[PDB]
Design a protein around this ligand. Structure first.
Ligand code: ADP
Lengths: 502, 1005
């Protein structure tokens, strides 16, 4: 159809920015679009399954895992899930990690077939935190901003997101309406059920919601999905009867299926003038897997790295004194306001959606925060500094170093990918020892001010002139300039990661 | 699941634990389950907490024999224990668990002894990135025990030598009235008895006892000890005459008759079988099936839920094979010159390059990092077993080839290689050589150019199926096509096959299958790049009645083992055919088979096991096998590990006495080699120092007895210090002269040896094998060329032992005797020397006849092998008029065919262009031999090609094989060959001394 053709065109234009948001809006107008869209993907997906072009695989996956998670109802006549299952069941011959993506999708598809709507209910229940006793889990959203660095538009976005729009009563209303719609198709009058619920108290609503979620999970646990679906449909009919509103359901005449946009999760905003993340630890006073602290750091290069320093710092602090994990299995999300550039070069999807940066920006932010689910690590260079008085300290840096404004003992072990530790000693009198991050790891190009010259290194040691104190910088930071240093070792070292789409 | 019970070390009685295991679970998962259950069930759980699961092995009995569940990644289903129990209706399973145990000090001492004998440690695991060698070592255990069980200690110890071919006609002249005289030396008596050619040793001994039953006293045979306790033995040598075979069927008797020498034998008690014990095996047998993965039905995924997927059949995958090349690093440059260097990768099956790809050239340096992906057009499902992923580093300005390295895409146990890899690349020393197929890495991991690659892993192993040869149901051909096809089949082995012919053969392959000779040509046409064709071919080979009924043809079977064919079943049927060969033919072809072992893609084959069995079943073959392999280990760094494994798997079953003999021989050779190296490093001083050193060696532990390498029946004794000396040569060999340690030796002749250093002999060893094969052919043709093979051998890097032809002088010396050092070559010199050495005219005539024979034989052989351009300073002649060559080590723009100097013409008397009876006899014999030989063009060509491939180190090109073909005059009438050979003879006659004189000048220069 013309609308279907436009859907395909928009999807194609996306594959090659705001295309994602535009597509989301377009599909959100009619429930039918969903199925239509899901068809086109399984067409294009199959294409790659033969052409063996790896790159396009990762984006489509997300789109699919997005589209299915938003559709309101799947008529039992529709078999599109079987088509997806068969299409993805033949990817296991693919290399790693694509097989991981396909395995996760297979698990998700089995879940959906057994008991539709499970994924939506789980996501919303975790987001709003109205979790059941058997499955007690929650979610958080923290927006750390530097008012000056973060532009006024970003500030408006954060303020809007921290706005407490919804209420738990509305959460129960939406969750029950969505579950019944998805399960019973159009044979229910959502208006009548909504009217009956609006009179119902919070306690009874929550009890019914908990029971419905328990029935959902139980059905998802059943072996045969075909029988499980009917079993759960009957159970929900019995639940509606017992509560006292069965009439709205099962209506012989179908209604008009309604799209249910995902709700808005809790959000709290804090100023973060400091580049030290410790601010968060304070809010702690104010289970790891039961919830996560989706810290949302606004991203500026200059400070990007200087704050990454803080991140890694507290990373070590908790790795040695794990307490934050006991509360939340943390997750971090950078937000360009070159830690992004690296992500984009590795994962182009990120480069085209996150790096490009309710209002369009807010929707994009929500989407990104909710679907980017692939932690990526960054390379980093550990070092140990021994001072005049025998004091020894361990530091970690990623940008560069500056040692000087002397008879510097300079030893270094260049390396080969093959693994040839070509040691070398250059005990030369130098003044300014500037480490440059030239760019499978890499080699900082050590610099020296004697006739100048600069060369790469892999693992280095510098010894001063008979306990000579030499100033050392940290990633160009003129604030933290350690001194009284006599010895300096440098070498590359290897839940709270740098969340990326990957 | 699978209910299985595991016995447990801890007792008051050994504990048991019944367990259910995944039907398709592997051994690792089962081990984890067993350890976890034991941690709970254990009466003393601390005992099992202290140790890990790896500190125990799983031994289960099968009819009484413990087998160990070795392969930790094999699937539980393939285990033969389950199948055997089902046959036995034993359940739930019973698997004893035994903690590891450190090897006994005795075991360590024995292991070090074997390492010393081999000359290279086998237990090392340094230059390896796999487990194939240890796995093969454990695998080979079963054949050793099986063969040892079925061996008669008596005959095994006596190891009589026999054969079964008909007597050559000329030799039937010597035997008359079907009887011959045998001399018996006993104590101090010599009695001659006439016995028919068809009287076995037992019958002859019984008849002799009956004759002399009244006179045992003089014979000095105790009355108690009856005939049972005495058997014949050849006087002066350790070779017996026992068994049940006509007296003419023992090689020694035929040799004596050929030599015209009265047969002498002496009674002696049987050698003790107890000396042949083998140390009780120190290992449990490894399970039966390890190299079988299953049928494609089970290993595929379609029709299975992903949660129930244990493995992915390789054929299911259908992408393009893809690899990632990271970089190349070398410590120091190879040269100082700006040259672009690019890596080139290829996929090769056999010698056929399935596909190629090349990278980007870059300014060469010590380090060059690419990190680039290469995708071959070939899909993953069409990877045949044994494919080689060749890698090369072409240094451009064509681009020189600097290094390379091979790699098996599929490892031994049928699991696609996956993960990271760091290889060490060999360095180059034509078109092809046997070196490029080495699967090993460079031991010098310090200063050897190394490369790094990456192959994408998978969430599961990608195994390979095993074919399910379900019968194939798959009329008459046009007669013209039949004629064309047959003509194609009739071409020479080397004749290339066009695409059209290949398609025809494959299309009409059921036609060819009805003809054995077509087999080698039929498999070349097969396209290896498709799974479907492979399946069809295996179906074709399933029906193998025609090949089986085919009479054994060694020449044909050799063609199969060439590198062309890397199929599992092709070489299996070839070995099957070889299984029928008797012992003597094996002695003939042993060196060529050992060479062919190189081409086998994997460490364990059918060929290796066949060799092991034949060696263990006999002594003599075992001896020669030992020396050949030991020579291979020392030299060829490419394959030292494989031969080391095979030889170790051997030496553990030979026995005791054999081990002691190897010990003594190796010690003596090492001492002499050390002295030789010390001496050659630097006049009469040299001789005095050598004699002093020999005296010291006597003062040292230079054993007094040892079987000579190239002649096990001959026991060397104590050196004759005075008779030794140093020859005058650019390499200065040593001249040793031992004396036999047998007190019963008839004569006092010494045992000569020449000990050469600083030169490889393998070329000479191979050429001598070729000459022996040719001699066998001619004997089958009922002639006598009186060729002179002598036993040469190599026993290390540039060290060799050579038999000494007694009473033998080079032709150059004879020339110097009269002419001196000018260059003139009078023809009367050789005749005068021979006549002087032969005062009796009858002796003179016999010597002339033998001289003509040997000259003809050697001329033919050298011409056939195309090495007849021998300088006039490498040919020897015996006082008996016999002639022969030596020094086949340097020979591997006029080009004379072969040396037929005019002096030979004078010897035969027909100087100039005149002729006489002698010359015509020479020509007649030459032509007879030449045609009889051309009757085996296939065998000659295949052996020569194998020699070139696995012989000289430098790269070889088809030009050599082109020449060889040309020479024999393949596919030409008998008269054409006669004319061609006579033309060669006349060309040799015409030139005269010109070429040899030029050679003399060049050597002087
Ligand atoms: N099998 C043999 N029996 C007796 N003498 C031999 C034998 N082989 C070589 N010689 C002697 O060794 C000398 C040739 O040595 P060789 O190493 O072949 O040549 P070169 O002098 O070029 O090194 C000759 O004097 C020859 O008599």
């Amino acid at each position: 159809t013309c609308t279907e053709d436009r859907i395909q065109h928009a999807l194609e234009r996306c594959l090659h920015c705001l295309n994602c948001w535009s597509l989301q809006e377009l599909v959100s107008r009619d429930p039918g679009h969903f199925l239509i869209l899901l068809e086109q993907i399984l067409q294009k997906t199959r294409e790659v399954q033969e052409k063996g072009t790896y790159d396009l695989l990762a984006p489509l996956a997300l789109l699919f895992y997005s589209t299915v998670l938003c559709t309101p109802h799947f008529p039992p006549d529709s078999d599109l899930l079987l088509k997806a299952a068969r299409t993805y069941h033949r990817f296991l011959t693919w290399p790693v990690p694509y097989c991981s993506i396909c395995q996760e999708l297979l698990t998700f598809i089995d879940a959906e077939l057994k008991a539709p709507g499970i994924s939506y209910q789980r996501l919303v229940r975790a987001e709003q935190g109205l979790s059941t006793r058997s499955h007690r889990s929650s979610t958080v959203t923290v927006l750390l901003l530097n008012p000056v660095e973060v532009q006024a538009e970003f500030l408006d976005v954060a303020d809007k997101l921290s706005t407490p729009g919804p209420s738990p009563h509305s959460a129960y209303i939406t969750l029950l309406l969505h579950a019944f719609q998805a399960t019973f198709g159009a044979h229910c009058d959502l208006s009548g059920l909504h009217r009956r619920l609006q009179s119902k108290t919070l306690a009874e609503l929550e009890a019914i919601f908990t029971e419905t979620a328990e029935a959902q999970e139980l059905a998802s646990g059943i072996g045969d999905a075909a029988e499980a679906r009917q079993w759960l449909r009957t159970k929900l009919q019995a639940v509606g009867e017992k509560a006292g509103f069965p009439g709205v359901l099962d209506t012989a005449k179908p209604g008009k299926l309604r799209t249910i946009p995902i709700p808005v999760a809790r959000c709290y905003t804090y100023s973060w003038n400091q580049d030290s993340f410790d601010i968060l630890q304070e809010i702690l006073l104010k289970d790891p897997k039961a919830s996560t602290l989706r810290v949302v750091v606004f991203g500026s290069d200059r400070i990007s790295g200087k704050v990454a320093r803080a991140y890694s710092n507290l990373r070590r602090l908790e790795n040695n004194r794990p307490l934050l994990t006991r509360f939340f299995k943390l997750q971090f999300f950078y937000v360009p306001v070159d830690i992004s550039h690296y992500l984009g070069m590795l994962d182009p999807w990120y480069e085209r959606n996150v790096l490009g940066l309710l209002p369009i920006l807010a929707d994009m932010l929500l989407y990104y925060c909710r679907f980017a689910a692939r932690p990526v690590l960054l390379q980093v260079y550990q070092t140990e500094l021994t001072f005049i008085t025998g004091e020894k300290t361990t530091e970690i840096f990623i940008h560069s170093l500056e040692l000087g404004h002397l008879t510097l003992q300079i030893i270094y072990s260049k390396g080969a990918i093959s693994g040839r530790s070509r040691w070398s000693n250059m005990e030369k009198l130098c003044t300014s020892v500037n480490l440059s991050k030239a760019c499978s790891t890499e080699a900082l190009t050590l610099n020296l001010t004697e006739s100048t010259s600069q060369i790469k290194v892999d693992k280095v040691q510098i010894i001063g002139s008979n306990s000579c104190p030499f100033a050392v910088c940290l990633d160009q930071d003129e604030r933290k300039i350690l001194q009284s240093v006599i010895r300096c070792e440098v070498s590359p070292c290897y839940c709270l990661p740098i969340m990326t789409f990957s | 699941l699978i209910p299985i019970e595991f016995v447990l070390p801890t007792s008051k009685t050994p504990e048991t634990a019944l367990l259910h295991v995944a039907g398709h679970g592997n051994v690792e998962q089962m081990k984890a389950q067993v350890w976890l259950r034991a941690l709970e069930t254990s009466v003393s759980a601390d005992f099992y907490h202290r140790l890990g699961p790896d500190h125990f092995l799983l031994l289960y009995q099968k009819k009484g024999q413990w087998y160990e569940i070795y392969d930790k990644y094999q699937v539980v289903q393939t285990l033969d224990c389950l199948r055997y129990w089902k046959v036995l209706h034993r359940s739930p399973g019973q698997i004893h668990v035994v903690q590891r145990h450190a090897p006994s000090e005795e075991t360590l001492a024995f292991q070090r002894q074997l390492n010393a004998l081999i000359g290279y440690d086998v237990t090392d695991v340094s230059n390896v990135h796999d487990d194939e060698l240890e796995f093969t070592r454990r695998r080979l255990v079963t054949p050793r025990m099986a063969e040892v069980a079925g061996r008669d200690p008596k005959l095994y110890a006596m190891h009589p030598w026999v054969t079964s071919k008909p007597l050559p006609e000329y030799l039937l002249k010597k035997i008359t009235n079907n009887c011959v005289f045998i001399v018996i030396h006993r104590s101090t008596t010599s009695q001659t008895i006439k016995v028919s050619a068809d009287d076995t040793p037992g019958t002859i001994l019984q008849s002799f006892f009956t004759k002399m039953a009244k006179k045992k006293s003089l014979m000095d045979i105790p009355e108690s000890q009856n005939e049972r306790d005495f058997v014949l033995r050849v006087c002066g040598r350790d070779e017996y005459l026992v068994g049940e075979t006509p007296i003419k069927n023992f090689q020694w008797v035929r040799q004596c008759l050929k030599n015209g020498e009265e047969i002498h034998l002496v009674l002696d008690t049987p050698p003790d079988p107890a000396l042949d014990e083998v140390r009780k095996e120190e290992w449990p047998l490894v399970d039966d099936c390890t190299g079988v993965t299953g049928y494609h039905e089970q290993l595929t995924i379609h029709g299975k839920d992903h949660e129930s997927v244990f493995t992915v059949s390789l054929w299911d995958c259908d992408r393009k094979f893809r690899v990632k090349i990271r970089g190349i690093d070398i410590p120091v440059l190879p040269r100082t010159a700006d040259l672009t260097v690019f890596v080139e990768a290829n996929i090769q099956y056999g010698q056929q390059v399935l596909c190629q790809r090349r990278t980007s050239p870059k300014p060469f340096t010590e380090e060059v990092l690419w990190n680039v992906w290469l995708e071959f057009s070939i899909k993953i499902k069409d990877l045949p077993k044994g494919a080689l992923l060749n890698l090369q580093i072409y240094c451009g300005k064509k681009a020189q080839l600097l290094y390379y390295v091979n790699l098996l895409l599929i490892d031994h146990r049928f699991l696609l290689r996956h993960g990271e890899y760091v290889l060490h690349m060999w360095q180059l020393s034509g078109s092809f050589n046997a070196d490029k197929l080495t699967s090993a890495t460079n031991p010098d991991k310090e200063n050897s150019m190394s490369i790094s690659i990456l192959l994408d892993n998978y969430c599961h192993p990608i195994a390979l199926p095993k074919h399910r040869p379900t019968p194939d149901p798959e009329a008459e051909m046009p007669n013209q096509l039949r004629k064309q096809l047959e003509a194609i089949i009739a071409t020479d082995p080397l004749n290339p096959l066009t695409a059209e012919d290949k398609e025809l053969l494959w299309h009409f392959r059921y036609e060819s299958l009805k003809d054995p000779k077509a087999y080698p040509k039929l498999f070349s046409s097969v396209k290896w790049g498709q799974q479907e064709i492979v399946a069809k071919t295996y179906q074709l080979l399933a029906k193998r009645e025609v090949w089986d009924q085919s009479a054994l043809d060694v020449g044909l079977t050799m063609q199969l083992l060439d590198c062309n064919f890397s199929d599992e079943n092709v070489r299996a049927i070839a070995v099957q055919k070889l299984e029928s060969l008797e012992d003597d033919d094996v002695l003939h072809y042993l060196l060529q088979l050992v060479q062919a072992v190189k081409f086998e893609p994997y460490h364990d084959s059918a060929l290796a096991r066949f060799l092991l069995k034949r060696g263990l079943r006999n002594k003599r073959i075992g001896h020669f096998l030992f020396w050949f392999l030991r020579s291979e280990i020392a030299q060829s760094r490419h394959y030292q590990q494989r031969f080391a494994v095979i030889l170790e798997a051997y030496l553990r079953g030979c026995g005791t006495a054999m081990l002691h003999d190897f010990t003594q021989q190796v010690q003596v050779i090492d001492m002499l080699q050390k002295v030789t190296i010390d001496i050659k490093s630097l006049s009469s001083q040299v001789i005095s120092q050598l004699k002093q050193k020999l005296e010291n060696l006597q003062n040292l532990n230079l054993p007094q007895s040892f079987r000579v390498p190239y002649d096990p029946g001959l026991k060397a004794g104590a050196l004759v210090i005075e008779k030794c000396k140093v020859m005058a040569s650019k390499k200065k060999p040593l001249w040793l002269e031992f004396k036999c340690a047998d007190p019963t030796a008839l004569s006092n002749e010494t045992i000569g040896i020449i000990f050469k250093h600083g030169d490889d002999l393998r070329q000479d060893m191979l050429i001598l094998q070729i000459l022996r094969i040719m001699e066998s052919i001619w004997e089958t043709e009922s002639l006598d060329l009186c060729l002179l093979p002598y036993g040469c051998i190599s026993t290390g890097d540039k060290i060799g032992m050579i038999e000494i032809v007694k009473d033998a002088t080079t032709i150059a010396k004879i020339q110097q005797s009269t002419v001196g050092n000018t260059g003139a070559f009078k023809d009367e010199v050789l005749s005068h020397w021979l006549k002087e050495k032969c005062p009796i005219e009858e002796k003179f005539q016999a010597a002339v006849e033998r001289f003509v024979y040997s000259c003809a034989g050697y001329c033919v052989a050298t011409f056939v092998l195309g090495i007849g351009d021998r300088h006039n300073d490498n040919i020897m002649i015996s006082e008996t008029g016999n002639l022969f060559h030596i020094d086949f080590g340097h020979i591997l723009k006029e080009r004379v065919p072969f040396v037929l100097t005019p002096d030979f013409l004078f010897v035969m008397g027909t100087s100039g262009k005149k002729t006489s009876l002698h010359f015509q006899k020479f020509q007649d014999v030459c032509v007879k031999a030449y045609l009889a030989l051309r009757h085996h063009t296939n065998l000659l060509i295949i052996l020569f090609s194998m020699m070139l491939m696995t012989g000289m180190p430098q790269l070889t090109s088809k030009e050599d094989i082109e020449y060889i073909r040309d020479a024999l005059t393949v596919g030409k009438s008998e008269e054409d060959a006669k004319k061609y050979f006579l033309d060669q003879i006349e060309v040799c006659r015409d030139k005269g001394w010109t070429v040899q004189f030029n050679w003399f000048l060049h050597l002087v220069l």
